[PDB]
């Protein structure tokens, strides 16, 4: 009776793709932005991935440039990085490009290297998290990316047929995303007889229960 | 995680006395009484992803005329047997339903569709119908809980989740058993653990992070 799928099909067909001013090729986003530089969880400490005391040994070495070396093989690459910063040795862009990008403490090797050597910041930008790069100018892809929340990023990474970021609608046609503003979204939604909302926040989910702190 | 939500939920769960639950259900018992495909809400909808489009159309036309071109896909053999049988008016026993895939390509069950043509058999075939095709169960029964749960809770149950909410009750898994607790016990223990809670927001058709509904 409600015919939601036909209504969504009508809604997507009402947009003027060719005349959108802003559009992005998905395959280019993929090539320019490795996924781990987009997802917000990369910015947090990576405790689920390494043994705690090996991380403890690595942090102490980072902070004092002396201490017992961690033995674990998971630590080899972060240890290479930590020794280089202690010893003042250079790391080529090729090193960052063949690394896992993400430092155990959260954020990127490239970003931490360039906090020590700002002369290399521009050169190392393609290996930094989008949340580590400078605030981008209005209208640019980096701008939209930096101001997407976690749900919008995930939809983007997943190639979703549409998603909402900020007040913008992103609509996938073929392998391109076309952007439309809030007012166009509403008018076409109304013409298809539809209402919409962005997915509600759920901080920790267990079954169908959304948990939060009382305060 | 400055809020330590996982450790608060661990506290929360530890506050319940499972002996004092309002009632309890064994997961193995649910599994025996309700084959999963009779629980899931998507079994009630057209099975478009499970068959090729041309064969569904041939099969639909076959059902309405009892003649014409047969769909030939190997997936469609059993639905075709069912379709022929309603056409020719031959009888299907409970044994045939029990040994079938249960779900008709157009949505719903073989048993329900058989019973629409032969209503005298409705009661006898209820164990092979979807829970949304059976009459509403009486208050206090498992089937009543299942019919009134909602989709997300059904999915939580079929996925064996650690806990979920149905209506106002809390279902808490302990081992292989679900224990039900009332909203006042739920709220008290959440309050002791420094936790607030809500059920997942309604989202009838999700595309990306967009939740769609009809403007009524």
Cβ–Cβ contact A48 with B under 8 A: no
Say whether B200 and A199 touch across the interface (CB within 8 A).
no
Do residue A105 and residue A69 come from a single domain? yes
* Domain count along chain A: 2
Do residue B120 and residue B157 come from a single domain? no
Q: Which residues contact B48 (CB under 8 A, 6 or more apart)?
A: B56
Region class of A88: left (phi > 0), else alpha (psi between -120 and 50), else beta: left
Do residue A158 and residue A212 come from a single domain? yes
Do residue B117 and residue B179 come from a single domain? no
Facing residue for B215 by CB, picked from A5, A194, A204: A194
Experimental technique used to determine this entry: X-ray
Measured from the Cβ of residue A66, the count of other Cβ atoms closer than 10 Å reads 8
Cβ–Cβ contact B168 with A under 8 A: no
Give me the resolution in angstroms, 1 decimal.
2.0
Residues of chain A neighbouring B6 (CB-CB closer than 8 A): 204
Do residue B112 and residue B215 come from a single domain? no
Boundary residue ending a domain (B106, B129, B152): B129
Do residue B65 and residue B13 come from a single domain? no
Helix, strand, coil tally for chain B in percent (to 5): 50, 15, 35
Boundary residue ending a domain (A110, A128, A146): A128
Say whether A206 and B9 touch across the interface (CB within 8 A).
yes
Do residue A137 and residue A208 come from a single domain? yes
Distance (Å) from the C-alpha of residue A63 to the closest C-alpha of chain B? Answer: 24
Do residue B137 and residue B199 come from a single domain? yes
Do residue A121 and residue A148 come from a single domain? no
Contact B173, B162 (CB under 8 A): yes
Its domain, for residue B19, covers 2-45+130-216
Crossing angle of helices A4-13/A182-191, nearest 10°?
130
Instruction: Using alpha carbons, select from A213, A8, A59 the residue that is nearest to residue B195.
Output: A213
Do residue B173 and residue B121 come from a single domain? no
Say whether B205 and A2 touch across the interface (CB within 8 A).
no
Tokens 């993929």 identify what position? A30
Say whether A197 and B204 touch across the interface (CB within 8 A).
no
Say whether A214 and B200 touch across the interface (CB within 8 A).
no
Boundary residue ending a domain (B97, B129, B161): B129
Q: Which residues contact B193 (CB under 8 A, 6 or more apart)?
A: B8, B9, B11, B12, B15
Do residue B31 and residue B54 come from a single domain? no
H or E element, residue A154: helix A150-158
Do residue A151 and residue A185 come from a single domain? yes
Contact B115, B125 (CB under 8 A): yes
Distances in Å between the alpha carbon of A29 and those of A147, B97, B208?
A: 16, 51, 17
């Amino acid at each position: 009776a409600d015919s939601l799928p036909e209504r969504i099909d009508l809604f997507v067909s009402l947009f003027d793709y060719n005349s959108a001013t802003t559009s992005y090729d998905i395959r280019s986003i993929q090539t320019d932005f490795p996924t781990r530089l987009l997802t917000p969880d990369s910015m947090l400490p990576q405790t689920s991935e390494y043994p705690l005391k090996d991380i403890q040994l690595l942090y102490k070495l980072a902070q004092s440039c002396t201490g017992k070396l961690p033995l674990s093989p998971l630590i080899t690459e972060p240890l290479v990085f930590t020794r280089s910063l202690c010893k003042g040795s250079s790391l080529s862009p090729r090193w960052f490009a063949r690394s896992g990008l993400i430092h155990p403490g959260g954020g990127t090797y490239a970003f931490r290297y360039a906090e020590k050597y700002p002369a290399q910041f521009a050169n190392l930008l393609p290996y930094m998290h989008i949340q580590e790069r400078p605030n981008a100018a209005e209208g640019t892809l980096l701008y939209h990316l930096q101001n997407m929340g976690e749900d919008a990023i995930n939809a983007l990474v997943s190639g979703a047929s549409m998603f909402g970021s900020g007040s913008d609608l992103w609509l996938r046609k073929g392998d391109i995303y076309y952007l439309f503003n809030e007012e166009t979204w509403l008018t076409n939604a109304n013409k298809a007889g539809l209402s919409y909302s962005l997915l509600s926040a759920c901080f920790i989910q267990r079954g169908n229960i959304c948990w939060d702190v009382e305060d």
